[model samples]
Structure formats: structure tokens, C-alpha cells
Target: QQPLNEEFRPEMLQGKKVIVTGASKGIGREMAYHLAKMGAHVVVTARSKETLQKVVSHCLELGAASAHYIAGTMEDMTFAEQFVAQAGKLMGGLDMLILNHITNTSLNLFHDDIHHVRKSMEVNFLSYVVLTVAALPMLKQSNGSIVVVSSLAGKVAYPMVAAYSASKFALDGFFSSIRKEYSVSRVNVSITLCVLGLIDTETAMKAVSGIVHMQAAPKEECALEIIKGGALRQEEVYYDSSLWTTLLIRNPSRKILEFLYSTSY
Candidate 1:
């Protein structure tokens, strides 16, 4: 077994090549900046070229070895597939691939309409699968890592975010399964899934301002936690402003059940 107790050092990312999706805004933008500050070569992607350009420029200013952006929508599977290749080339090759894109969604009661559900599944879940497949070869070459961004809704239940929750739960299921396969296959690549709580991003604040009464974690620290987890190759990272929320999110029963099931298999 590999060592899991080594302390995470910021220099772990120095000169590494990384791709951060949804990097034009919110947590994704903060992550890009942190990577830059660590002297990583970064390729960030999002829909708006203008915003992406600004991020890339700022990354360079912040001390990134190299910074580039590729603008596109994750809703298109083709774009998701090509994005990995393009980003890999831009960075020479990839060492870490961070999946952080999500379709715009607001807190809402589940309605009869299925469009939001389908859209969430496509952009939030399926695109991550597509991106992983595209980046697998490059990752194999470098024994790199995959960091999947999820939310608190992904673990515990929360009302008014049914479609979003469904999509996030899918990430946990699909990626966890892939992690098992990688283990059996003796693949050196690492997979880390980050579960975050309410974050103080502009979009999140706008969506929950009058609603969900809770303190939001700073996006800067949240971003750094995500990067630390990824660099350390943790299987999962839980980040929440509330200690109780973080403690409750861990499902020891689920892990025990999974272990039992594996024995049966």
C-alpha cells in the first residue's frame, strides 16, 4: 500500500501541470489562483473567453509557470472530450485534472419538469466521466491525480436541490467505482473527491441570500483545501464552515457496507 500520511506541502504542485474546469468563476477561479501561486502550469476552461483571459492573465501575474485558457460549454460532450486534449497540449502534459463545472442551478422544489434533471446529469455528472476518459492516457503517463468537486448535498439530503443532489450523488458513485477499478488494475493515478459546504461565492450568495440561513465558508480557504486534498492524494475531503456538518457527513456505515459487499464479490 502507498503511504497516505505524508503532510501536504505547497511545493508538491510546483511546476506541475494542472487543468481546472469552470475556472472562470466562483470556487474554480479561486482554485486557479491558488495553483498559480504554487507555480503550477495551469489550463483553465469555462464558457466565457473574456473571463477566462482575465483569469489566465492573473495566473501569470500570480507566478504560474504557464497559464492558458480554453473557453467552451461542458454541456457539449464533444467539447468536454476535446478540452482535455487541448489543455494537455497547452501544459505539455497533465499532472492533475480538477473537475469543478456545474450547470447553473438555484434552490427549488422538485417540479414535474425533467429538463433540469437531464441538464444537471449531463453537465454535472456525465461531462466529468467524459473528461476523465479523455485525460486517462495522459494521467497514466505521469501517474497523475483526478480531483472531483462535489457538495454537501452530495452526501446528506437537502431540500430544494433535488436535481443538483442527484447529479452530485452520481459523481460519488461513478468515481468511487472507477477508483476501485484503478486499484485492481494497479494504476498509479490517484482520485480524490472533495465535498464542500455552503461557500461564499457570488452566485451561491445570490441564490441563498434570503434562504438557507447559514454561515458560508470563504471561497479562498475552500479553494485551498481542495488543492491540498488533491496534492495529498486523499480519497475524500470534507469542507464545511460548520464542524457538525462535517462530522455528520462521514458515513462510516456506508464504508462498512461497501467493505462487506466487496467481500461478497
Candidate 2:
């Protein structure tokens, strides 16, 4: 097995072609900037074309090998499919696919909003699968990685964000299974699932202002660690302010259970 905490060098991303979704703001934008500093060829996407233009411009200023942006809503699955194709062509191929787009959601209880739940699943979970399928061919050629940005709510339950949490949990189920399938099929791609705690992003801070009292981690460092985890091909990376939360979130028993179950299969 590969080491869980390998030293990640910025050079690991140099000249690599990457696609980052939800990159108009927050952690997504930070990741785009980090890739730029690493001299990576990058394609960043989000809903706001105006914001994306600025991000692409800054990436060039940061000395990225190349940078481009395609703005659209992740709610549109057709857009998700075509975006990967266009990005692959623009960069000649793909080296990393960062799945980070999330539907706009505020902290709310599960009163009776099936529409919200469906929309969340569509954008957060289904669109990610769509992007993965569309990018699989190019990623296969390059032996690339898929970095999925999730949340602590994905691993364990929280009071608010029921729809959001459900969508995130779906990601863990789908991507983790595909990782196993790839191993058996001799596919060389890697999938890194990043579980983040409360981050100091403007939107998140605004959403959890009164409800959540936890320390918000810096978005820049969170972005860097996500990149590191993906570059190192770690199956999962947990980032949070509380060390005990991180420790308790991991499940050795789950691994052992999975191993035994696989043996039976």
C-alpha cells in the first residue's frame, strides 16, 4: 500500500493538466490559484463567467503553464458532460478532475423539501458521476486522479444540511465502489475523497453564522491539503480544526469489515 501521508511537492503538479469545478469562489478558487503557482495547466468552471475570467487572469499572473475557464451551472448534466470533453481538448488531455461544485443550499431542517433534496443530489452527486464518466477516457490515457471535495457532514450526521449531507454520503458510496472496480479492472486512475470540516469560506461562514460554533479552518490551507491528498493518491483525506474529530472520524473497523467482505466475494 502507498504511504498515507507522503510528502507532496508543488512540482508534482507542474505542467499537469487539471480541471476544477466551482472555482469562481471559496476553496475552489483557492485550489485554482494553488495549481497556478505549481505551473499546472488548468481549466476552472463555475456559474459566473465574469468571476471565472478574473480567476483565469490571476492564474496566468501566478505563472500557470496555461489557464482557461468555462462557466455554467452544475445543475445541468449536459453541461457537465460537454465541459469535460472541451477541457480535455483544450489541455490536450486531463491529469486531474476536481469535483467541487455544490448546489446553493442554506442551513435548514428536514421539514418537507423533496425538491431541495432532489436538486442537491442532482448537482452534488449525479453531476459528479456524469463528469467522471465523460472524463474517464482522457484520465485513463494519463493515469490521472479525481479529487472529490466533501464535508464532515458527509461522514457523520449534523443537525442542519440534511439534504446536503445525503448528497455527500452518496458521493462516498459511489466513488469508493468505483475505486474498487478500477483496481480489479487494472485501471490506473486514482480517486481521493476529501472530507472537510467547517471552512472559513464566505458562503459557509454566512450559512453557519449562528448555528455552528466550531473553529473554521483557513480555506487556503484546506485547498492545499486537498491538492496534496489528490497528488499523493490517498484514498481519503480528513481535514478539520479539531484533532479529536479527525481521529474519531476514521474507522479501522470499517476497513477490516470491508476486507473480510471482499474476501468472501
Instruction: Using lDDT, give the best candidate's number.
Output: 2
TM-score between candidate 2 and the true structure: 0.97
Clash counts for the predictions, in order = 0, 0
The digit string of per-residue lDDT tens for model 2 on 107-146 reads 9889999999999999999999999999999999998999
Superposed by TM-score, candidate 2 places the C-alpha of residue 109 at a distance from the truth, in angstroms, of 1.1
Error of 1 at 234 (Å): 0.6
Scanning candidate 1 in windows of ten residues, the lowest lDDT window is 1-10
Give lDDT tens digits, candidate 1, residues 1-265: 1425888888999999999999999999999999999999999999999999999999999999999999999999999999999988887899999999999999889986499999999999999999999999999999999999999899978899999999999999999998888887889899999999999999999999888688999999999999999888888999999999888888889878977887898
Clashing pairs in 2: none
Candidate 2 residue-wise lDDT at 20: 99
Task: Flag clash pairs in model 1.
Answer: none
